[PDB]
Amino acid sequence: NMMVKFAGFLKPLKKTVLAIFLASLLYTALGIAGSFYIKFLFDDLIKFEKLNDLHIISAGFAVIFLLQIFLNYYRSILVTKLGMSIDKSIMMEYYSHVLKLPMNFFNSRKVGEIISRFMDASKIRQAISGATLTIMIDTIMAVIGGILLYIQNSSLFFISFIIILLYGIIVTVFNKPIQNANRQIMEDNAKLTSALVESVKGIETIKSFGAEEQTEKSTRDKIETVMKSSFKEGMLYINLSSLTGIVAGLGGIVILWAGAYNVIKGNMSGGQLLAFNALLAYFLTPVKNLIDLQPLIQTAVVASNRLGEILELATEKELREDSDDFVISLKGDIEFRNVDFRYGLRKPVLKNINLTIPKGKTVAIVGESGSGKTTLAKLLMNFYSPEKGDILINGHSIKNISLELIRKKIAFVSQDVFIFSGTVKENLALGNENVDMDEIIKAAKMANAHDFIEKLPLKYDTFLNESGANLSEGQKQRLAIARALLKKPDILILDEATSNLDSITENHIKDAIYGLEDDVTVIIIAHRLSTIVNLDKIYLLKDGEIVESGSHTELIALKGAYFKMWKQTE
Amino acid sequence: NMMVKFAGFLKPLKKTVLAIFLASLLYTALGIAGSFYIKFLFDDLIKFEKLNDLHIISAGFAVIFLLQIFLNYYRSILVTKLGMSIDKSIMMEYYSHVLKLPMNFFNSRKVGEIISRFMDASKIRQAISGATLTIMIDTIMAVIGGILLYIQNSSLFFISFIIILLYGIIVTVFNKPIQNANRQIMEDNAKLTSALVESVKGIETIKSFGAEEQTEKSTRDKIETVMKSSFKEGMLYINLSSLTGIVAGLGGIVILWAGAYNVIKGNMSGGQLLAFNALLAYFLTPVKNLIDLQPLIQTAVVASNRLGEILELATEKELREDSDDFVISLKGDIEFRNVDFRYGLRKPVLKNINLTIPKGKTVAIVGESGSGKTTLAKLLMNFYSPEKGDILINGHSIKNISLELIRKKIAFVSQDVFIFSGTVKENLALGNENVDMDEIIKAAKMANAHDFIEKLPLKYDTFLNESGANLSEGQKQRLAIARALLKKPDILILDEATSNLDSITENHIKDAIYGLEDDVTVIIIAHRLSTIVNLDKIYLLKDGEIVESGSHTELIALKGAYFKMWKQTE
Ligand SMILES: Nc1ncnc2c1ncn2[C@@H]1O[C@H](COP(=O)(O)OP(=O)(O)O)[C@@H](O)[C@H]1O
Ligand SMILES: Nc1ncnc2c1ncn2[C@@H]1O[C@H](COP(=O)(O)OP(=O)(O)O)[C@@H](O)[C@H]1O
Ligand SMILES: [Mg+2]
Ligand SMILES: [Mg+2]
Known part of the structure; x- marks a missing residue:
């Protein structure tokens, strides 16, 4: 449904998508190459006391990082343009559809509900934004990092894989209730907005009867309910954040412990251990960053689902039966x-x-x-x-x-x-x-x-x-x-x-x-x-x-x- | 003016803030030990090949990290509670005040703009939003992590100081235009939502005269203006993030270069260099993380200013003169x-x-x-x-x-x-x-x-x-x-x-x-x-x-x- 809608918007634009994908390959390759700086530092330069080579190597790695940043900048610009096009298409389609619904829909619902449904699309804009949409691209690119880590040290590889499994388990387990809570808070906020528009429309009557205090007391319960729903939804993030932080930090300690054990056993030397630890930033940190954005991504999914409810409603013309073309003027009885x-x-x-x-x-x-x-x-x-x-x-x-x-x-x-x-x-x-x-x-x-x-x-x-x-x-x-x-x-x-x-x-x-x-x-x-x-x-x-x-x-x-x-x- | 309102709402919660500060203080002290852990790993255990000591020390530092996570969780709960309370107080104050405004205010301004300000106050909720305050809390205590850095070394501390200065310069220089762009986008979005409200209100007439395309075309133009403003804001954010990435990465590589040069000269051991590098996660990473969330405080600041624009308006009772208390019955000529x-x-x-x-x-x-x-x-x-x-x-x-x-x-x-x-x-x-x-x-x-x-x-x-x-x-x-x-x-x-x-x-x-x-x-x-x-x-x-x-x-x-x-x- 919405997945097909997003795919349809991506059909016309392929050169940007191809460029976005290809630019990411260079970015990941440059980052992987630049990771080995600490290994080159702690195996040859420091150990053998080389000074000029140290300066040359540092200059080379700084150049590599500069190229990496330039590629990231280019890719970010392209991603932002793509996301803006997609968001424009989504908003335009939703408005064009909502303007053609049958009258009984407008009778049943209230103005505030429709308004809140429309403007929740701003949440979708945040998710599709360039800064966020970059993060998933890195997650797809983490396959190269995983292959490289497996090539480097097989034994240490089955220590980051377990970390990713724990990440995924936590992600699903908190994926269900977080979605439920976001839907609840959106419904509650929509209820709050509708009663506010009603208050604004009848400001003359409220002022005439001196019902400002009664009205603000009525708005308390809606504000209080919104705060309760947010706070209940707040702890779902703290629990998720703490459980992720348990795996992320303790995973690093475990990896360092295992690497120290291997070095003591004379397996890979300290330099390769430091290289493995640093290069891990291109295999776990992209995943860790993506999981940290699950609160924001879940919001966009719920907002799109709420917009999906309206778009599923048949338009006024769709309900109408086949129209006879032999009539052109409404003249008669x-x-x-x-x-x-x-x-x-x-x-x-x-x-x-x-x-x-x-x-x-x-x-x-x-x-x-x-x-x-x-x-x-x-x-x-x-x-x-x-x-x-x-x-x-x-x-x-x-x-x-x-x-x-x-x-x-x-x-x-x-x-x-x-x-x-x-x-x-x-x-x-x-x-x-x-x-x-x-x-x-x-x-x-x-x-x-x-x-x-x-x-x-x-x-x-x-x-x-x-x-x-x-x-x-x-x-x-x-x-x-x-x-x-x-x-x-x-x-x-x-x-x-x-x-x-x-x-x-x-x-x-x-x-x-x-x-x-x-x-x-x-x-x-x-x-x-x-x-x-x-x-x-x-x-x-x-x-x-x-x-x-x-x-x-x-x-x-x-x-x-x-x-x-x-x-x-x- | 607005900052005074924030301060006035923390006066009752004296005890809660003290708990956050004390829990936060132990959080950073517990977190510094990771640097000492990597120091001990690459300075004593690896060199002398101690295994039982390796296991014991790894377990101890894992316990330290677990305590750190627990303190972070407790502090996060307290911060979320405080943020919810402050948010509720502010938002109800604004709603009551807007309900008390004079009559001519509602004639000049359409309902769309007022509702837009109401629901753009949601960005203040998104800004406080619990975990965000923890980043400022870490940043303001990044001093205590920084102080020992000067004790551990001098040149590396000065280089990190230069990095911080570059951060600050970038933050101000991009601070001003970000506020400008956020104000522009909020105004455009307010116009769009007012147009949508007006269109929905007169849906019957629009359907009767078949004026769907014209309304659709006007809404399309408004959406295009909104997203041109959003595109400008996005490019500004991309430039900010790219400059921050440049300075952060070059800072890290320069730290490694200077530390290697010091190690070759024998100023400090390689383990001390690794400890310094890993300790920068408590002096620079909190600062960079705060700067990464600049498009969340500036948006909140603009939203708060827009709300204060309404809040500064004199209420109906304020404009009235000294009311006579001797009149109780409105009976007469x-x-x-x-x-x-x-x-x-x-x-x-x-x-x-x-x-x-x-x-x-x-x-x-x-x-x-x-x-x-x-x-x-x-x-x-x-x-x-x-x-x-x-x-x-x-x-x-x-x-x-x-x-x-x-x-x-x-x-x-x-x-x-x-x-x-x-x-x-x-x-x-x-x-x-x-x-x-x-x-x-x-x-x-x-x-x-x-x-x-x-x-x-x-x-x-x-x-x-x-x-x-x-x-x-x-x-x-x-x-x-x-x-x-x-x-x-x-x-x-x-x-x-x-x-x-x-x-x-x-x-x-x-x-x-x-x-x-x-x-x-x-x-x-x-x-x-x-x-x-x-x-x-x-x-x-x-x-x-x-x-x-x-x-x-x-x-x-x-x-x-x-x-x-x-x-x-x-
Ligand atoms: N949207 C609606 N929902 C429910 N009842 C309605 C609605 N519109 C009209 N009615 C009912 O139809 C009856 C006739 O209303 P209407 O035709 O609008 O006024 P009049 O008969 O004076 O022209 C009213 O008693 C009203 O209760
Ligand atoms: N909110 C307003 N803003 C601007 N002009 C108004 C407003 N309300 C009324 N007017 C103008 O003042 C005049 C007041 O007429 P009105 O008192 O509404 O007549 P009646 O009492 O027969 O309804 C109208 O001609 C209208 O154009
Ligand atoms: Mg009249
Ligand atoms: Mg009638």
């Missing part, structure tokens, strides 16, 4: 047939809805709060799929239509309006892009928005903050209408789009609505019944079920729920 | 006297407000969207201070009253209702640690919310997820009204709280308001304009000016702007 829907496993929201919106007409959806009108709009726009029944457009199931066409021919003006940080030109031309300014200004004029935008500085270029508060509530709601009309939708849905506008702007928008292009279906969802008295048909929702349908004239003519609503409200 | 307010030198939102609310009456403020009604309400609750004029309650300036009293006797029902994750009982009792169950049920019945609470699976215990996604808008408004009523305030402000309610619930609410103690002033900010006919006084707000004021019949008789609105909306 929108029909609901026994549609039932429930937000998860709770009580049903819509119960046996049967609708028939005539082609190129304006219809109305009215009802009390929480009666499923916005849910009907979302179902028509296919954010959620109906549990039972189907939605037909011109006699064709909405399931058998490409998702892009549905989301491009249908415009939504939600109950709220979301404004992205950028110029007003960018916000108006969201998604469409590459559109003539003549079209944008025409849409803004059509929505009675060209005036207030003209007064503010920079015209269609002023900067807007995240959910720009410098724009009034009515101003933002005018942008959404202009944005919807900008795409020339085939079906227009207005969800409380006339709630914060004066009579003049409402009349202007109505006049624009009655004459966009003709034969365009317009669905208006509103609570003020007075504004909706001049439409073709009106549907009344009563707790997820239509009760009476028709125009305004006959709906008041027959006495019922609509008549009571009209009389009470006016 | 609310008067606005030439109040002028602007949202950060942008434009005059309210100009010369001259308003007076009679004591214990119900007064409604009406106007077009963006006129500044919510701004008036927020001004009355000291979220912002007017740049000109003053607000008086019973003849006393509002800025001269205690902040806690102001926000405890004034209830605000915002246009958007915020529901915190948890039980319904928790949300209804926000701000009050506990009052009673009779009061809560009375308020819920008063606000007509008790009926739909009972229908829930767990009455007053149902778990509301995030922002009450399982609750309708009307239900959320009813909960907010009940929560405001439960406070039992002196001034009640309704900011279009009746927009989503139906006829019967609104009638119940308005009957409940009339049932108050006749001393609770009620301010009703409404947009419907038909919910005002039965109110004491009406203020018409236009372009931040009170143009018309009076009773409903009086205002209609005036045939002014209010009359136009009344005849247009009805």
Whole structure:
């Protein structure tokens, strides 16, 4: 899974990989050659009292070490570049995938959890970094060191092998619980982050009710739990570090003891013993360094696994059934047939809805709060799929239509309006892009928005903050209408789009609505019944079920729920 | 400033530090014996071929090393405990302070930057992180190892001194740009995470308009900027590590060269040279290991500075003047006297407000969207201070009253209702640690919310997820009204709280308001304009000016702007 993903990123880049591998051979060879300095020092130069040869040999070994450092520098640069490319690919893929998940995923999870999942990729960046990724390369290169040590002294070789076996045993034994603890601490920190975002969002309410002390007391338990998980995870490192330190240091003492015994037995002389001890830094220290990074590597593995959970979720388009290519325009009659829907496993929201919106007409959806009108709009726009029944457009199931066409021919003006940080030109031309300014200004004029935008500085270029508060509530709601009309939708849905506008702007928008292009279906969802008295048909929702349908004239003519609503409200 | 905070948190733990210092002191003393071990190996045992002495001495030094490991383990446990305590103290202090910050702070800065600073405080956790402090502890005691080096030899000690000087020079020279690069990368990452948060928040609109690629492209650009900064930091680290490797390796080889020259001259025995070389692991290796972890303290320093940037900001209470203690009840005449307010030198939102609310009456403020009604309400609750004029309650300036009293006797029902994750009982009792169950049920019945609470699976215990996604808008408004009523305030402000309610619930609410103690002033900010006919006084707000004021019949008789609105909306 993730292993295949990493391999795929490495397929295009081979020259760097070949150079990285080949440069490591020179580095290890130079280090091995430079190890013998102490042997040459304690067998010939010191014993025979040679001075000039001492200087020459020292200069040569210093030169060798300089070349070794230069090779290490080159390899480090290449490794850093490779790791950066891989990290960029990983982050880009994760974001591109998370932006295409179904809506129920966003409903189920919280913002903080998704944020924490994303930014945990920084842990992966640390592991793939050049300084770390060098260490494993040395571990693969330790085979040459092992062969050389076996060639030097066979008896001493079966003393470092045992050390590596002990290292591996410790590594597995602490590999399991360390992974468990890192997963636990990541989950706990994700829980902490989510409650912090909620605290920031509702800062106004918290301040108004004086609940700062209560909120910080609530955050204690999450901070305390994070500290407990860290401390429990802390001792797993100390135990690992101490057990490794037992093997590493005591292994050196044992090796020195065995070498002294061999020298006393007249086997290899002291110089070869010192050479063996020094050369051991290219067979054990690379392994010892790698084991010391197991805490950091385990963190990256858990972070990647957590990212893997999201990437395994099927996208919105993947779930969709094969799309019929014979449909290009959503022109016709929108029909609901026994549609039932429930937000998860709770009580049903819509119960046996049967609708028939005539082609190129304006219809109305009215009802009390929480009666499923916005849910009907979302179902028509296919954010959620109906549990039972189907939605037909011109006699064709909405399931058998490409998702892009549905989301491009249908415009939504939600109950709220979301404004992205950028110029007003960018916000108006969201998604469409590459559109003539003549079209944008025409849409803004059509929505009675060209005036207030003209007064503010920079015209269609002023900067807007995240959910720009410098724009009034009515101003933002005018942008959404202009944005919807900008795409020339085939079906227009207005969800409380006339709630914060004066009579003049409402009349202007109505006049624009009655004459966009003709034969365009317009669905208006509103609570003020007075504004909706001049439409073709009106549907009344009563707790997820239509009760009476028709125009305004006959709906008041027959006495019922609509008549009571009209009389009470006016 | 920050370093003083660290010192203040170690004052209680006097005994713990002493144990770490004493245990650390014996650690280095036990660890020095390895040098004497190699000296004895290559000076006496090998030369004279003693076997039993070899075995005995090897066992003794193995025991010495075991004691050293045990002391290191105990010290590491203590260090981890201390680090966890300090970390917890710092992080909670920051969270509390950021919760106490003024309101205008949250308007300028997006949530993304704040959360980014919060979770970049994790690098301080990664920096202390137990074992890291042991390296500084060894470094500060590397002096005692160094002192005997001068006794053992002079020239080699001077060469090691030169090595230390080169370390220090390199550390400073690369210290400065490392801080620069770390600050740059943190800023870029904060921008990236803010963009991600903004993208996730408006996922519905992005999907509706098909703006996935544009958001994806912007995120790609932000990621590229982040990783360009990261690449610069990586090259800086590579250069640092390569220079440190040069100096360390040349230092080791020069130690060997000078020691060999001394041995040839007969200054010291070869065993003494080996002891000196192996003892450098307690004078230089602690220093080099500390320098290797420079990209862990500089990152921590930058993170701490970024947190202190927020911590230096004055809290809401600090900016307030000497609060009068003789005011306990916010009952009287609310008067606005030439109040002028602007949202950060942008434009005059309210100009010369001259308003007076009679004591214990119900007064409604009406106007077009963006006129500044919510701004008036927020001004009355000291979220912002007017740049000109003053607000008086019973003849006393509002800025001269205690902040806690102001926000405890004034209830605000915002246009958007915020529901915190948890039980319904928790949300209804926000701000009050506990009052009673009779009061809560009375308020819920008063606000007509008790009926739909009972229908829930767990009455007053149902778990509301995030922002009450399982609750309708009307239900959320009813909960907010009940929560405001439960406070039992002196001034009640309704900011279009009746927009989503139906006829019967609104009638119940308005009957409940009339049932108050006749001393609770009620301010009703409404947009419907038909919910005002039965109110004491009406203020018409236009372009931040009170143009018309009076009773409903009086205002209609005036045939002014209010009359136009009344005849247009009805
Ligand atoms: N994400 C969700 N999770 C659970 N329930 C939901 C969700 N969205 C809507 N509902 C339920 O659907 C019903 C109708 O909601 P909605 O259509 O948004 O408001 P309205 O009916 O006023 O347009 C509400 O009672 C609400 O409880
Ligand atoms: N946080 C803010 N930052 C900048 N400008 C703001 C902010 N909040 C409101 N404004 C501006 O001040 C005015 C206040 O209008 P507002 O009180 O929201 O009207 P209403 O009371 O009808 O909602 C708006 O025109 C808006 O542009
Ligand atoms: Mg709705
Ligand atoms: Mg308002």
